[PDB]
Design a protein around this ligand. Structure first.
Ligand SMILES: Cc1cc2nc3c(=O)[nH]c(=O)nc-3n(C[C@H](O)[C@H](O)[C@H](O)COP(=O)(O)OP(=O)(O)OC[C@H]3O[C@@H](n4cnc5c(N)ncnc54)[C@H](O)[C@@H]3O)c2cc1C
Ligand SMILES: [Cl-]
Length: 488
């Protein structure tokens, strides 16, 4: 008989899940498994993202329960847990969604050889990206494109991505009863308290496929907005209603299928002939994700500067004091500190807000390596993506893809063009809530009487600016021009 395991890592969803569909076909018993390391906090991960993952597992649990099955959260590492459960459960087939991350390749290749020795057939469909990214490289002559323009012409010749897979059946083959490793007390979904976190999450975005599909339908309530979407024209200061979809956490964990998103976009585009085109369109935003996945999965050392063949070797400063002030939202520039506060509280910021804080730390003002900034983003972002975080950090620091280092965002003027009254700043920096709008982006320029009346005295309640942007940005541009000349 056929007993199968569907192994969730990403792809935390029931819709468009070809690995789940294959596991369930002709199966007597199906074991939906997520493997959790109970000592992940011993040597990195904010409670905001880890609880987002836990909320995604609880949503999967309710979906399987509604279909007569159950999600098993196994504690341990995959190389030690799977050899046991293969024999105990009589497994004949192991299915999981393909993954191209570095550790994913080492981990999955080990699980492949263990299944082989146990007589278990392995099926690994592709469904986390729009396309088989290896097929895109092979169609391009054996190398990934290095520009978005060249990449978009490639996918146009390749054609549309595969349609989303059908829904799973209304009833699922359940796990066998009275299996010791499937005991409910040892396979439940933990809380953030039980895994060791002492501070509760503060983010307003809840995990799960249900929330992902709810947010998708909300975005498509106005097809005119979807059709005319232009990414560079969206408001980074909008927080009551963010200016973009905020689907990145759900796409990162696979709570939302990228192919379903793409299919829904095509349905709208065919009724709106004047819809926006790549790279600025909403479809173009998914192509950015596909582009960085295609380049990153084929480039060694993609997340580092050293050994990375696509990253410029820049002599970045080792300044812990600048990094600490940037990391702790005490730079003295309210626009920067407000966004860095949104990072630690929400775990998500608008794309152009990420631009501001990334440019400031690296090629704009402080000249600290983008790897240090990525380390800070990798801890707090609920949508942290190994390939996307790295690519955009190299972009913003002009180390890869982007080269126009004379374009420098002002930590004073940038946000003022969107939010002259500083509503975003008052929301995330309540110490400046009473400051008149004339000085909220430059609180040090406010006369002392105004600072006292507003209850925010620069130097006691809110720090002075750690740098002069005029001086600091001039020093950073001159240094980048010399680094660009020595790297020929
Ligand atoms: C320094 C820096 C680091 C970043 N780190 C990440 C990261 O770790 N994870 C992440 O998902 N995005 C990252 N991005 C990209 C971008 O900031 C987010 O994807 C976007 O803000 C998410 O909001 P949204 O879901 O509303 O995007 P939308 O505009 O609604 O776009 C929809 C989807 O397209 C994809 N997408 C959009 N913009 C980009 C982009 N620039 N690159 C790649 N894919 C994109 C995402 O999957 C996103 O969910 C980073 C940007 C910067 C400048
Ligand atoms: Cl600017």
């Amino acid at each position: 008989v056929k007993n199968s395991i569907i192994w969730f890592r990403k792809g935390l969803r029931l819709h468009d899940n070809p690995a789940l569909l294959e596991a369930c076909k002709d199966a007597k018993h199906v074991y939906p498994v997520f493997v959790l390391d109970p000592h992940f906090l011993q040597q990195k991960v904010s409670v905001n993202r880890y609880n987002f993952l836990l909320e995604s597992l609880e949503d999967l649990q309710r979906s399987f329960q509604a279909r007569g099955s159950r999600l098993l959260v196994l504690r341990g590492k995959p190389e030690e847990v799977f050899p046991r459960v293969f024999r105990e459960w009589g497994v004949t087939q192991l299915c999981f969604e393909h993954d191209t991350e570095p550790y994913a390749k080492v981990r999955d290749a080990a699980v492949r050889r263990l299944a082989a020795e146990a007589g278990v057939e392995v099926v690994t469909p592709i469904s986390h990206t729009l396309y088989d990214t290896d097929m895109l490289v092979a169609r391009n002559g054996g190398a990934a494109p290095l520009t978005m323009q060249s990449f978009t012409k490639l996918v146009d010749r390749v054609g549309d991505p595969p349609a989303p897979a059908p829904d799973p059946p209304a009833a699922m083959p359940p796990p066998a009863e009275d299996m010791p490793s499937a005991a409910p007390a040892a396979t439940g979904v933990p809380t953030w308290q039980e895994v060791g976190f002492k501070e509760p999450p503060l983010t307003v975005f809840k995990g799960g496929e249900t929330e992902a599909l709810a947010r998708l339908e909300a975005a498509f309530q106005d097809p005119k907005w979807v059709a005319g979407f232009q990414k560079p024209d969206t408001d980074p200061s909008a927080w009551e209603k963010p200016a973009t979809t905020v689907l990145s956490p759900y796409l990162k964990f696979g709570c939302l299928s990228a192919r379903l998103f793409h299919a829904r976009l095509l349905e709208v585009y065919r009724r709106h002939p004047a819809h926006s085109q790549p790279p600025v369109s909403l479809r173009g935003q998914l192509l950015w994700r596909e582009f960085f996945y295609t380049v990153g999965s084929t480039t060694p050392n993609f997340h580092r500067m050293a050994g990375n063949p696509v990253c410029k070797q820049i002599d970045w400063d080792d300044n812990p004091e600048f990094l600490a002030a940037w990391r702790e939202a005490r730079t003295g520039f309210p626009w920067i500190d407000a966004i860095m506060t949104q990072l630690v509280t929400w775990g998500w910021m608008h794309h152009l807000a990420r631009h501001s804080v990334a440019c400031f730390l690296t090629r704009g003002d402080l000249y600290v390596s983008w790897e240090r900034g990525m380390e800070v983003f990798e801890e707090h972002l609920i949508d942290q993506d190994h390939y996307l975080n790295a690519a955009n950090w190299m972009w913003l620091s002009a180390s890869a893809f982007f080269s126009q280092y004379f374009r420098v965002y002002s930590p004073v003027v940038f946000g003022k063009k969107y939010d002259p009254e500083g509503r975003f700043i008052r929301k995330f920096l309540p110490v400046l809530k009473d400051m008149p709008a004339k000085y909220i982006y430059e609180p040090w320029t406010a006369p002392l009487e105004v600072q006292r009346k507003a209850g925010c005295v620069v130097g006691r309640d809110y720090p002075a600016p750690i740098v002069d942007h005029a001086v600091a940005s001039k020093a950073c541009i001159a240094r980048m021009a010399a680094a660009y000349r020595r790297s020929k």
